[PDB]
């Protein structure tokens, strides 16, 4: 029918933390004369009204499935949002990776805390070690990944690990 | 913050004692990245850069991180006299070289008298008897308790970790299990300890019945 | 001062003399350390597989040295609830932690056999001294946390010092105790006793006393 609107994740991680902040955007129509985006949570209606949903403190009662739709742009498609709680979090863009593409892994912290001596592991064994905190760009798909990928760090002195995520 | 980390280890006593095994002091750099490696060891022995520092490759570690070990061949006397040895490492990851120093337990020694207890008469009821080697008040912790039989070693023994006595000396009890058949036939079993406070660094008593 | 990074929690069991012996109050302890300028508060929740917080009574925050108000709270146990094997958990929660951290200790598992208790007399050559060393060999038990004490009839000498349990070649532990007394008491003619307390021991007591 009419053009579908799309939900844009600001930032691009659909996995957040009980204190991290996410902002959602929606482009599809820009409601020519007068803007309005109508937002949908778990199949319902939020009173945001603007073109951007503002989630400062993420906290479970904020996860689910999301949708949007301006003055046209039909109705947006389903974008998921998870909100774990912990110290570490292996953020990713998506997790379905076959054939050969490029992955941009991130070992998130918590309450923008620093993370000393960071590591990324391949269902057990590590593959890339870093002294300070940075992401783990892997270009051109390994053709043998697809095992549990997680990360471990050091939040001051605490020995913190991350909850696993399976990629393929 | 964080970076590579250094661990300085002393020679194992059986090496420094008994002139036959060269004594080495190993310096271990760990958490050394793959990008930004190249670690430079600046060895010091009582104020002497001593350029016999033999280092090793970049070890391969599950966590991708690298691990470098370098052994410095030491002298049997220079360790015991009390010379202070010292590792200093730098790597572009370290904003200031990390140095750590060691030098053997610097404190007033003592001699270990080596008494040797025998099996209890009820234990001779069991299927194997337990021979005890008592080693009373000594200094410092380092020591080498070992059992031997007739000619050569016995490795059926477990030795208590050094305890601290009431005066400040270290006692330890080694124990070794044997066939009641083997103990009653009369084989003599000798307990040999090696401490830096025993002339020739080697006393050795014996047990039988 | 401080530097911070997320509090920590340590959980210790009850002391064996308090478990193997009745009318002793045995206890489980939750030591929480590294709270700071945020003035993170208490909140302690103890469980046995989900439970009530009556045996609790948290103490006062104490900082001592490094300006990180140590907090501790101690839970009382029945001598019988231990030993058979419960669990005991902490769940302490601080306003500077992501999710409440929790630890459990329970009892050590495993087949416990009874500790043998041999008694050893001064070494032949050790009598050339004003002080001899009585030796007590407790060999063959399993649950490490054991108690060893010496005594002369009805008096407790702190002469002895004992080895900590050391794993043997069959999963059982063995230790040694040393008691240094002036030879006179030895040759003179006294009777010295090495009491042993182990959950695998009849009435949790056995002493294999020795004399010349
Ligand atoms: C990536 O992986 C590597 C290696 O992989 C793993 O390595 C080990 C740990 C196993 O888990 C393997 O399965 C696995 O492959 C990681 O490298 C490790 O890093 C840690 C710390 O990050 C190091 O721990 C230190 O260990 C030393 C002693 O290490 C000896 O004993 C270990 C266990 O027995 C053994 O694994 C070591 O190889 C080493 O073994 C000895 O080696 C010598 C040399 O050949 C040999 O002669 C000996 O015989 C042999 N030992 C035996 C028994 O035979 C330990 O002492 C350190 O503790 C100090 O620091 C602690 C931290 O504060 C402190 O709590 C301690 O008390 C002690 O502190 C110091 O003590 C004195 C007294 O006061 C004084 O100097 C200081 O005041 C005091 N304080 C300080 C701060 O120094 C420490 O725990 C591992 O050794 C190391 N593994 C190595 C080198 O092989 C790496 O971390 C991983 N990284 C990531 C990001 O994942
Ligand atoms: C700021 O404040 C204080 C400062 O106090 C300091 O105390 C010492 C350390 C000196 O430095 C002083 O100069 C100084 O004043 C610090 O608070 C302390 O912090 C340390 C480390 O952060 C803690 O150490 C832990 O201790 C436990 C054992 O603790 C008992 O024994 C200690 C002596 O051995 C004694 O000091 C303790 O008070 C405690 O004593 C017990 O007390 C209770 C009641 O009070 C009593 O009922 C008990 O009977 C009694 N016990 C005894 C024996 O007397 C030790 O086991 C810990 O080791 C863990 O961590 C290691 C490294 O992470 C690891 O290698 C160990 O294996 C172990 O880790 C656990 O291992 C097992 C499995 O292997 C398992 O449980 C877990 O998987 C694993 N991890 C965890 C988390 O459990 C550890 O060394 C002190 O307890 C603590 N409190 C004190 C001293 O009161 C504080 O750290 C300072 N800040 C900084 C940055 O230093
Ligand atoms: C939109 O849908 C999403 C899911 O698609 C939904 O997120 C869910 O919210 C609930 C609300 O709390 C979460 O429920 C928790 O589930 C965990 C399991 O991981 C339980 O451990 C928790 O139980 C505690 O909660 C109670 C209240 O604090 C206590 O009384 C109780 O004893 C426990 O302590 C808790 O129930 C759930 O995890 C998420 N995520 C899911 C289901 O994936 C979201 O809430 C929906 N939108 C809105 C506006 O609610
Ligand atoms: C918020 O979370 C609590 C937890 O169960 C729940 O009672 C409440 O309904 C949640 N809010 C919404 C809108 O679901
Ligand atoms: C602590 O983290 C290290 C990684 O630096 C990991 O190897 C180790 O397993 C963790 N702790 C324990 C008790 O295993």
Numbering used by the authors:
A (entry chain C): 4 to 171
B (entry chain A): 235 to 443
C (entry chain B): 232 to 443
Reproduce text from the manuscript describing this model:
In these mechanisms, the effectiveness of inactivation depends upon Fc gamma receptors (FcγRs) expressed at the surface of effector cells and the interaction of the extracellular domain of the FcγR with the Fc portion of the antibody bound to its cognate epitope. In contrast to humans, macaques only have one low affinity FcγRIII receptor, CD16, which shares a polymorphism at position 158 with human FcγRIIIa with Ile158 and Val158 variants. Similar to human low affinity FcγR receptors, the macaque FcγRIII receptor consists of two immunoglobulin-like domains packed against one another at a roughly 80-90 degree angle in a comma- or apostrophe-like shape. The Mm FcγRIII forms an asymmetric complex with macaque IgG1 Fc with the Fc binding near the bend in the comma-shaped receptor; the majority of the receptor’s contact residues to the Fc reside on the C-terminal second immunoglobulin-like (d2) domain closer to the cell membrane.
